[PDB]
Structures are given as C-alpha cells and as structure tokens.
Design a protein around this ligand. Structure first.
Ligand code: NA
Ligand code: NA
Ligand code: NA
Ligand code: NA
Lengths: 211, 227
C-alpha cells in the first residue's frame, strides 16, 4: 500500500497550488489524513490534521480536503517561503501502521516548466562478463527540480536494487538526476524487458530496454 | 509546548550498534506516544513504528524487524531507538516525534502537542574503506538525442570516497559532456555516469575515450567506448 503524491507542484507568486495524495479504502478511505511541511534539512512540521484542521500558527492559506480515497492540500497566495516538501500521511489498516506519501516538492516557478529528457542504457557486455548488470537511467532538462522514478520488469514494478539521486542543475539551468537499477545477469537475460519511468508535472516518460 | 531533544550524529561501522535518544523537554513525557520515522538522504519519510509512553509497549512497522528496538526510561523522560548489526543501508536521519492515536471522529480531543518532531539524529554507517571504481562503456545510442547524433558514456561504479573526475579524449572533447552528480548507494559506495553527445557520422571513425581518475585509490582508467 502506498499513498501516491506527485513529485512536483508549482506556480507563480500569488497563485494557488493543489497537491494530491492518492490512496485506497484501507488507508485514506478509513482514516484521518495529516499533512506535514518539511523545509530542506529541517524536521517535518504538522500542517494539517484530521483532513482539514490547522494547528496554531498555520495560516488559512493552507487548506486540506479528503474525498473518498484521495486527499489534497491547497496552498493559496503562493510565496517563496512555502517552498518545501509536503507529505500526506494516514493510518493504513493493511500495514497496521502510519503510512507517509512520497512527498511533493513545491516550487515557485523562476522559469517556465521544462519536460524531462530520458536516456536509458542497458548493461554493457563487459559488466555482464563481470557477473553484474546495471541499467542506467539519465534524466535531464527538467524544471521544476523533482521527479519520480519507477522501474519495471516486463512492466511490473521493481523496487529492489534501485539507487536514485536528487535533482541538480546542469549548465543549462535545468535539473538532471540519475537512477541505477542493479540486476543479476540471469535476471537481465530472463525477462522480456526492463523500463525506467519518469514522472514530472504533466509528463510521464518511459524508456524500455531488452537483452 | 512539546520539545524533543535528540542525541547527536553518529558515525558507525557495519556490524556495530547505535542507541539514539529522544528526551522530552518542558512537558509531561507520558502525555503522548512517540513515533519514530526514518529519512534516507534526499528521500521520503518512512514510518518505523511508535512506543506507548504510558504502558511502555512498542509497535513496529512491517519493514523494521529484529534489528530495530524502541525502549523507554521514564526516570529521565527519554525514549530510545536501538539498532543492532548496523548495515550501510541504515544510513539516514532518525526522527522521533509525538503522535496522535487513531480517532473515530473529529469530536474527539485534540492538542497540537500530538504531533511535534525532534530535530532528528543522523546515523551514518560506512566502512570508509578505499574502493577504486569499475568502469564500463555505455555504447552509443541515438534514441534520446538530436538528429544525426548519438549519446555514449562511461559508467563509473562502486568507488569510495569521492571524488572521481572524468574527461573525454584527454580533455580534447568538452562540448556536450555531462558528468552526473554521483549517487551514494545503499551499499555505502558511490557511482556516477559521464555522457557525451557526438555526431552519428563520426561513429565509425572517431575514437572516444573516457579518462576516469579516482585520486583517493590512485586509480586511473581509460575506456574506449565503441559502437
Ligand atoms: Na543524491
Ligand atoms: Na521505564
Ligand atoms: Na503514528
Ligand atoms: Na485516524
């Protein structure tokens, strides 16, 4: 069970932004939603509790909502000081525990949105001879600076053996990141294909390689 | 007002243990349960479980088995997280916080003290052993690049510590080179890739060589990257 949040939400100063949090009947369906604000390098802070209530010191610019098995955080009057990662969380009856979403970076646009270019390299024959296999997914040219990378084997999700960087800018003033999937040569050979899927704002880009 | 004071940073070898403290400061310790939450560097929050500060009984998330133990010492208003047999993949910041119970409805009692976080404790697990890289060619592919060009590269795998430098054709080739920030893997080793976009027509007659230098291990590798 996961609570699915977009990697990135963005606007210009003063705009409203609406950050989604998608669950199921056995988490958001059944339980109260909380939102946290985490500024980079700092502890998460409670923003919203019980779906739509604000603790003291939280301005009513921040609003929460819950509908069936999804929830949302709206931020009006967007300003720089809002820039942070935002997490939703609920009790998940299936995990018997509290579950956090993946988090959404909020960016006040300093330039127009730019969609990611994705380059996916298969393992080299040399590496396979060394009894290892690394798929290399290079993601470039995006803004704002946050993505979600998902890997698939024969188009089912693979979570094991994944290492993904944060975004950093290249000289073109757009963000890039890299993600690496580690396999055995036996895994690589035995599947029809592996995929790197990158989600960014309105874009999903999926590149697939085969042995 | 809740304040939670957490013990400082820890630098640990694989197989060692660590005991992180989370001390309540300026409120009554048994008022609220304490939740533990991990965050690997640059990544999301992971709920580890929580401990009941009245009864003492811990409850663990499914991810977190024998090696992770929550405990209390109510003589000094402190919750602990104890990790044994530390792995490099344990590296991250470990937060404690107060937590709310599950509620039936919104008519139930609420205080803001229900959800207040400590600053977190960074636990770094690393051998800090010097490891040279393995370098592999990333053969040219035209899929992702402009008309009449192809991307090719080198994968520089499993080294420690930073840094690695990469040049192409001994510095003669600089245009369109991108050497990506390294990833710090769950293994505790680094990898990175360097990619360059070149003319497709050149492929059958221009040699491309990445020059990888890992000073810390005194390793130099030059890899020819062929179609
Ligand atoms: Na990173
Ligand atoms: Na005790
Ligand atoms: Na909790
Ligand atoms: Na609840």
């Amino acid at each position: 069970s996961v609570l699915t949040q977009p990697p990135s939400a963005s606007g210009t100063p003063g705009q409203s932004v609406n950050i989604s949090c998608s669950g199921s009947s056995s988490n958001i369906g059944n339980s109260y939603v909380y939102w946290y604000q985490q500024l980079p390098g700092t502890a998460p802070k409670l923003l919203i509790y019980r779906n739509n209530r604000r603790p003291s010191g939280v301005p009513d610019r921040f609003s929460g909502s819950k509908s069936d098995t999804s929830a949302s955080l709206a931020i009006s009057g967007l300003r720089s000081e809002d820039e942070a990662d935002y997490y939703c969380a609920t009790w998940d009856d299936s995990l018997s525990g509290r579950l956090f979403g993946g988090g959404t970076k909020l960016t006040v646009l300093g330039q127009p949105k730019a969609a990611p270019s994705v380059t996916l390299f298969p393992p080299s024959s040399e590496e396979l001879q060394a009894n290892k296999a690394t798929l290399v997914c290079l993601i470039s040219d995006f803004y704002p600076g946050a993505v979600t990378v998902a890997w698939k084997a024969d188009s089912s999700p693979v979570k094991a053996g994944v290492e993904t960087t944060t975004p950093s800018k290249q000289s073109n003033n757009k963000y890039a990141a890299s993600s690496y999937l580690s396999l055995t040569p036996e895994q690589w050979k035995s599947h029809r294909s592996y995929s790197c899927q990158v989600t960014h704002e309105g874009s999903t880009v999926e590149k697939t390689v085969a042995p | 007002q809740v304040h939670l004071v957490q013990s400082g940073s820890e630098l640990k070898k694989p197989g060692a243990s660590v005991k992180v403290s989370c001390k309540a400061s300026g409120y009554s310790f048994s008022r609220y349960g304490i939740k533990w939450v991990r965050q690997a560097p640059g990544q999301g929050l992971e709920w580890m479980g929580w401990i009941n500060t009245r009864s003492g009984v811990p409850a663990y998330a499914q991810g977190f088995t024998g090696r992770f133990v929550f405990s209390l010492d109510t003589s000094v208003d402190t919750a602990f997280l104890e990790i044994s047999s530390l792995k490099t993949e344990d590296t991250g910041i470990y937060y404690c916080a107060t937590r709310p119970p599950r509620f039936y409805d919104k008519t139930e009692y609420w205080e803001d003290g229900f959800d207040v976080w400590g600053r977190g404790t960074l636990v770094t697990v690393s051998s800090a052993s010097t490891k040279g890289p393995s370098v592999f060619p990333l053969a040219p592919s035209s899929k992702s690049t402009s008309g009449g060009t192809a991307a090719l590269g080198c994968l520089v795998k499993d080294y420690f510590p930073e840094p690695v430098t990469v040049s192409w054709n001994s510095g003669a080739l600089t245009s369109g080179v991108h050497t990506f920030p390294a990833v710090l893997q769950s293994s505790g080793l680094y990898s990175l890739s360097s990619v360059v976009t070149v003319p497709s027509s050149s492929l059958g007659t221009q040699t491309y060589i990445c020059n990888v230098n890992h000073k810390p291990s005194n390793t130099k590798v030059d890899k020819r990257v062929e179609p």
